[PDB]
Write a protein that binds this ligand. Structure first.
Ligand SMILES: COC[C@H]1C[NH2+][C@H](C)CN1CC(=O)N1CC(C)(C)c2cnc(Cc3ccccc3)cc21
Ligand SMILES: [Zn+2]
Length: 107
């Protein structure tokens, strides 16, 4: 799978700019919004809806309409420094508590 980057230095600096990430998508048919994705640090791999974060290297796929780019970034890549910079730890905790409390009402 490859370990997530938790340093303050991006794993993919060529994708550090919003505009660079935006080009990777092209025509995007998926339920998830490409500008929203690029904003959350993601660029497209060109394989279905597979994206990676420029900073942590974290990969995500199979975007349901109910799944938010930032929330998913926090769910699966909580050590991402870009995520911490943009959203703050207070936002990150809420998302974590929300997901971890979803583990309650399902089970
Ligand atoms: C499949 O789980 C549920 C889905 C549902 N839709 C959400 C938007 C996201 N969510 C997590 C996810 O997609 N994960 C979690 C985990 C970290 C375990 C992981 C590992 N590898 C891949 C595949 C991949 C490899 C390389 C680049 C991109 C994608 C996807 C993936
Ligand atoms: Zn990240």
């Amino acid at each position: 799978m490859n370990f997530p980057n938790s340093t303050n230095l991006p794993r993919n600096p060529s994708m550090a700019d919003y505009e660079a990430r935006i080009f990777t998508f092209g025509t995007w048919i998926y339920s998830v919004n490409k500008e929203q994705l690029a904003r959350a640090g993601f660029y497209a791999l060109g394989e279905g809806d597979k994206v990676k974060c420029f900073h942590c290297g974290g990969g995500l796929t199979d975007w349901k309409p109910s799944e938010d780019p930032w929330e998913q970034h926090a769910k699966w890549y909580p050590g991402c420094k870009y995520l911490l910079e943009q959203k703050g730890q207070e936002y990150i905790n809420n998302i974590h508590l929300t997901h971890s409390l979803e583990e309650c009402l399902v089970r």
